[PDB]
Every structure is written in C-alpha cells, then in structure tokens.
C-alpha cells in the first residue's frame, strides 16, 4: 500500500474501464455547479449541511494501553527486532509529515528531487479539531 506506484499500462490488454471508475476519475478535480460533479458529492454536501465541523465530542475511552511488552533476558537481538517492528521507519514516515524547512533543506541545499522523497501524509483526517485527541 505504501510504495504503490501508478505506472502506465498498455492499452492492448484484457483490462477495461468499467463505469464505476469511469465515474470516479472525472470528479477528482471537478468544480462545483456541475451535474456529474454534484451527483457524486452527496457526502460532502451532507457534511456541510448539518454543521458537522462545529460539533462537540461526546465519547472518550476509559483506559488506553500500549501493546504488551515481550522481554527476553540477555539478548540484544530481541530488543533490536522489537524496536524495528514497533517503530518501523517506513510506516512511521507514512503516517507523519516532514517539516517544510527540512524539505527545503534536502531539496534545494542538497539537490534531492521530489520523486525520491519518502512518502508522507497518509494519516486520515479527523472529523473536527475536537475529535483529534482523547483529552
């Protein structure tokens, strides 16, 4: 999922464009006051009609707990493997974002282009600001 690349495919193949993705890709950059744009934008209109971006949070959990620690006495390989699994840099980078000045540092001051940046900004957006945390 993380390093999925949308490469081009040759047309001479058995794969088609069914009507579902023939409707899906049109409304990616479509504006408002359109027919087919508004016929596929039911969810956003229902979001902004009911004033859902100024609502309050009603439920918070009672107990929050980290995953159960596994310990092996006298082996650094276990600690390295557990730290690699719990804090894997690819998925942790995918769920986070690089700071802007850091991006300017590695792109301009170091010459690294855009396409070999690590993938970032894949965390889902919460409903409000109020739903972003349990506190």
């Amino acid at each position: 999922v993380i390093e999925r690349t949308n490469g081009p495919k040759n047309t001479d193949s058995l794969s088609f464009k069914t009507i579902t993705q023939e409707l899906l890709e049109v409304t990616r950059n479509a504006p408002s006051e359109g027919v087919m744009a508004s016929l596929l934008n039911v969810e956003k209109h229902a979001y902004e009609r009911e004033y859902l971006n100024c609502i309050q949070r009603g439920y918070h959990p009672n107990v929050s707990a980290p995953p159960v620690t596994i310990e092996v006495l006298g082996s650094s390989h276990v600690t390295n493997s557990i730290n690699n699994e719990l804090f894997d840099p690819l998925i942790s980078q995918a769920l986070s974002d690089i700071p802007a000045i850091t991006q300017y540092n590695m792109h301009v001051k170091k010459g690294i282009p855009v396409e070999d940046f690590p993938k970032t900004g894949l965390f889902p957006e919460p409903l409000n600001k109020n739903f972003s945390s349990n506190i």
Partner: protein, 442 residues
C-alpha cells in the same frame, strides 16, 4: 416522486376538536380509527411521555398503512418517522437486539443551537503559501466591502475550499464560519486581461455594502443514532452511509446519554421525540418481543406503532398460537386500534379519489361497474384496473374510459378467485405439491 399507492393522502383530515370529516385530505371513512390516530398525533406533538406502544389491527386492505402514512404526513417536518418492515431485523452482521436498538434510536432527534458568523464581500488579494510536497498550507486573504476592508488568515480546509470553485481576485464570495462553506455569488470587478485557461461565464453582481461580518444563529436536527455512529470510531461518518456500524458498545451509548442530558441542562440542545412504525409486526421472533418489552421502559423511547393483519396465528420461534401472532406480555403493555371493513359508498369514493390521483377520466357507468367488481372482488384489484383500462381506452384514440375498456381489462387480467378456479379445474398441467405434472397433451 412518482404516482404511488398512498400518494393521495396528505394528512389525516381532522378538525380542531379532533373530529374526523367524512372526506378530507384524501381519507374517507374509518372515523374511530382516524380519531384515535389524531389523539396519538397530539400525544406525539406534546412530547411529554415516552415508550407507548400502539397496535393497529384489522383485515387486509383496510387502511392501516394508509393511516400510518396520514400520521406521518400530518406529523410535519424535522420530526423523525422511522418506517421499517418486520423482516429487516434479521441480518448477517448485526444481532436482532442491536438492529432493534438502532431502529429505536433513529426515531429520537436532537435539536442543537449553533452560533455562526457570515462574511460576504469582494476579494482583493489571495496569498497562499504551501510546502514543496503540498502538505502544509497557510495564507492570508484580503476581502473588502464598500465601507470596510480586512485581512484574514486561512487554514488547511479554507485553502482547500478556495482552490476548488476557483476564485480570481474580484469575485464576490460568502463564507459561513461555522459550516465552512464557500459560495461564489459572482464577479464584480470585470477585469480586462483574461487568459484562455477558463471557460466559465460568471455573472455580474454588485459589490456588497454595510458590515463585512454579521452574527447569525442556526438550528439543525441530528438523530441520536448519528451521534452514536459518529462517536463510535475514527471514521464513523462514512459508516453513517455504508452501514458498517457493527455492534456499538454500551459504554458509547451511556456516555452519549449523559452528554445529551448535559446539553439539555445548559440550554444548548433540546429533545424532539418521534414515531417508530413497524409494519407487518408478526414476522418477528420471540426474542425481539422480549427485547421490546424492556426497551419500551427506557427514558429515550419513541412512540412505537405496529400493524398486523393476522388472527390467532402461530408466534414465530415458539410452538403455540397467540392472538395477532404476539405474546400476551407484549399485548398487556399495548393499546389496540381496530379498523373495520368498507361499505360500497366508501369503495366508490376511494375509487374516485384514486382515479383523480392517476389523472384518469371516468364515466358514471364505468365507475359503477368498478364499484360492483370492487365489492365482489377485493378493493385493490379494482383500483389496479384503472390504469390498465386507461391505456386500453387510449389505444382506441379517445381519452375517456368506457364500459368496454373495463370489460376488456376484466377479461385480460385475472382475479385471485378466477385464477384459483382455473388452477383447480386443470390441476394436472401444474406442478403439484408432490412434484407431479403431465407435460404431454396426449
């Protein structure tokens, strides 16, 4: 949106003293049932009592669903009316009690007061600063009216709303602060230099005057089930549409109940109860009735209405027979409205109203023949014959249904009793209950 079965009923047809008129608002006859339903309607409109069960019983084709449609039509806007059939409870991803809990909680609305600020003006200059990968976005907006001019600040979603429906520094927009909606009213500057990267034909509006920022109060209604589904997990708003809300835990419902009482205490929100209508209630398990017996005693419970057309039939999930197919403990805590069968004058008035609904011209003799065949056979058959006779009469290039068209429609399309007789006369040609049939005609 189309001409349906109950499309001719708009209300209940009652006075201020709750006395039913003999023909009003598309309903004829049935004065006691209409009066009782009006009492139940006033009982819902007062909103001071909860968890009352009303049972509507009678023979088939009598007007139970018509009465429920009249109640829902006269209930008015923004009051919830959940109408389900009895067989929708049995699901593959939800237990019966969970589906019944969701159906109960869909019929209680919460009316929330909100404070918003409306900003309308003429756009002077837009500055948008984004990072290299386009993740972090911030900027400043300079908007103005004829009197004032202010420089604002923008966030991520404001910039995303400005990038869509692209504003070009001279368009007149209106912003709602609490809703976060961008509306482009039109273009007022009418700039001279235009490049051919745009094809819109934006209207000429005037620059607004007066105050730039105004204060407004808005009111919207949200049901309890939506609040539960939203607070259940991270992406519950999509599950409000996809139906992927699998067995919400009880702690969520307890905390939502406490929060709703807290909102009622502060004057922010108020509770508007509604009606849950369970049509064909005899198709329910014994466990559903056992759940309903205790779900009716809660504080947040709507007015439950059930309808059935069964006599002393077998209760589902058991091995005995009960009146109306419902067990006696549920029937103890319910109030029964009984409907009566129809006369011939009522049947003639019903057919005349249904003919006027379908926009069909009828003669006197055609209406009399339809009344006679609706007395002999069922009412619904003679009601169904009207559109078929209209099409047959339209085939002969005249827009008036005559007796010959009704006779042709009666000849072409069969009744229940005529079909039963034709089956019983030639029972070898049909597949029996033992699966035997003579296909050869010799």
């Amino acid at each position: 949106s189309l001409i349906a079965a109950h499309s001719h009923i708009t209300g209940l047809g009652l006075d201020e003293n709750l006395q039913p008129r003999p023909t009003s608002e598309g309903m004829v006859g049935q004065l006691q049932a209409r009066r009782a339903a009006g009492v139940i309607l006033k009982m819902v409109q007062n909103g001071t009592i909860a968890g009352r069960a009303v049972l509507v019983a009678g023979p088939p084709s009598t007007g139970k669903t018509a009465l429920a449609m009249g109640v829902s039509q006269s209930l008015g806007k923004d009051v919830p009316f959940t109408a389900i059939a009895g067989s929708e409870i049995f699901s593959l991803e939800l237990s019966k009690t969970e589906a019944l809990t969701q159906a109960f909680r869909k019929s209680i609305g919460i009316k929330i007061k909100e404070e918003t600020e409306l900003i309308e003006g003429e756009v002077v200059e837009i500055q948008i600063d984004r990072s290299i990968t386009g993740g972090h976005k911030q900027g400043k907006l300079t908007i103005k009216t004829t009197d004032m001019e202010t420089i604002y600040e923008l966030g991520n979603k404001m910039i995303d709303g400005l990038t869509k429906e692209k504003v070009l520094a001279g368009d007149v927009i209106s912003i709602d602060k609490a809703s976060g909606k961008i509306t482009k009213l039109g273009r007022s500057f009418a700039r001279s230099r235009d490049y051919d990267a745009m094809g819109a034909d934006t209207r000429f509006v005037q620059c607004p005057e007066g105050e730039l920022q105004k204060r407004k109060t808005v009111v919207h209604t949200v049901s309890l089930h939506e609040i539960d589904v939203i607070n259940s997990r991270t992406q519950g708003f999509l599950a409000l549409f996809t139906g992927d809300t699998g067995e919400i835990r009880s702690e969520v419902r307890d905390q939502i109940n406490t929060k709703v009482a807290e909102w009622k205490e502060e004057g922010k929100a108020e509770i508007v109860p509604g009606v849950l209508f369970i049509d064909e209630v005899h198709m329910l398990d014994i466990e559903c009735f056992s759940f309903i017996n205790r779900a009716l005693e809660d504080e947040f419970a709507p007015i439950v209405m059930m309808a059935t057309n069964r006599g002393v039939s077998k209760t589902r999930g058991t091995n005995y027979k009960s009146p109306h197919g419902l067990p006696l403990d549920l029937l103890d805590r319910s109030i029964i409205i009984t409907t009566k069968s129809y006369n011939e004058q009522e049947i003639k008035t019903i057919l005349s109203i249904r003919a006027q609904e379908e926009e069909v011209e009828l003669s006197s003799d055609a209406l009399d023949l339809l009344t006679k065949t609706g007395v002999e056979t069922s009412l619904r058959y003679s009601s169904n014959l009207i559109s078929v006779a209209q099409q047959i009469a339209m085939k002969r290039k005249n827009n008036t249904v005559e007796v010959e068209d009704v006779k042709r429609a009666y000849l072409l399309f069969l009744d229940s009793a005529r079909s039963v007789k034709y089956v019983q006369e030639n029972e070898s040609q049909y597949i029996d209950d033992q699966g035997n049939v003579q296909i050869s005609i010799a």
